[PDB]
Amino acid sequence: EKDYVVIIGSANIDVAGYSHESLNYADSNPGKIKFTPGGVGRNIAQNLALLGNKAWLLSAVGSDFYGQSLLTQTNQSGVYVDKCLIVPGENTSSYLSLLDNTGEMLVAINDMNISNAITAEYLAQHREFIQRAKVIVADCNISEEALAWILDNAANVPVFVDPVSAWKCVKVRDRLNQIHTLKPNRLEAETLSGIALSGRDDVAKVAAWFHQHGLNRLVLSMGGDGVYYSDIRGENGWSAPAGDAMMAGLASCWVDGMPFAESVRFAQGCSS
Ligand SMILES: O=c1[nH]cc([C@@H]2O[C@H](CO)[C@@H](O)[C@H]2O)c(=O)[nH]1
Structure with a gap:
């Protein structure tokens, strides 16, 4: 009731454009352009609202009118x-x-350089508010400094961290001991661990690497091989019967009281 989730990440306007016919690289080739709310953090924040949690976005948009419409658009969605x-x-x-x-x-x-305006100075202005969420979700679009501030100031609130990409995921390598749940895909887990994820036979040692480095929970998407999950306390398995629905799933299920493996399966069905 006074339980709320806090999402710290970026909000993008996704612009998708495509031509109707073969793209003539000369003049205005008619097509269909779709504007879309986006950003990994803003998406997770929206999905948590749809899931029924009180979701607070901590992000940055510009004073460029279309910024304020992103905010309003996601607001209508619950956030x-x-x-x-x-x-x-x-x-x-x-x-x-x-x-x-x-x-x-x-x-x-x-x-996404505005992503860099999500500073520690900004976040510190809501230290009390952030420290009272049932869970914090952070993406790796924000700076190393900002993510460092979240992990350093979560006040025992679990930080679910979405690694966003192979490029942006590395900022968490040295801070896995502060992250409750990390959701890398294959390449991001390869990038972080330095261990090749050639197939299912290798996840055991990758996950073992994450835990040696203090990761509480790993939810590793192997694409077609499904999802591997691993708790530092020992519980691991495969669920092998989007990533923004996955993260929302995991965080919402945690707040809902749901056990680890059942949350991975649920989130994986929010994904599909
Ligand atoms: O580097 C990034 N690329 C894309 C995204 C966003 O992720 C969404 C897809 O999951 C999409 O909305 C994009 O804006 C991001 O947050 N950071």
Whole structure:
């Protein structure tokens, strides 16, 4: 009732554009362009609202009008955007996307320096508020310094961390002992551990590596091989019967009181 989840991460305007016919690289080739709310953190925040939790986004948008519409749009979806930064005169984050007639991803551009405005100084302004959430979800779009501040100031509140990409995930390597649940895919787990994840035969040693480095819980998506989960206390298994629904799933199930393995399976069904 007074239980709420806090999400710290980025909010993007996803722009998806594709031509209707073969792309003439000359003049305005008619097509269909879709604007979309995005960012890993903002997406997880929205999914938690849909799941029935009181979700607070801690993010940054620019004063660029389309920033304020991102906030409003996610607000309508349930999220308490009341606390975000509106950054004066910055481009709000966005994730440009160029699809094909087959929805085939051609090129993708990413403008997210505003993500760096989610500072420790900003987060410290809500130290009390953040320290009273039932759980904190952070993505690795924010700076090393900011994520360091979250992990250092969670006041025993569990931090679920979404690694976002192989490039952005590394900022957590030295801080796995502060992360309650980490959700890497194959490449991100390879990148973090330095151990090749060639197939199911290798997850045992990867997970063992994560735990040696203090990770409480690993939820490792192996794509087609399904999901491997591993608790430092010993419980591991496979669920082998999107990632933004997965993270929301895991965090919501935790707050709901659900055991680890049952949460992985549930979140994996929120994913599909
Ligand atoms: O580096 C990043 N790329 C893409 C995203 C966002 O993730 C979403 C897809 O899961 C999408 O909305 C994009 O903006 C991000 O947060 N960081």
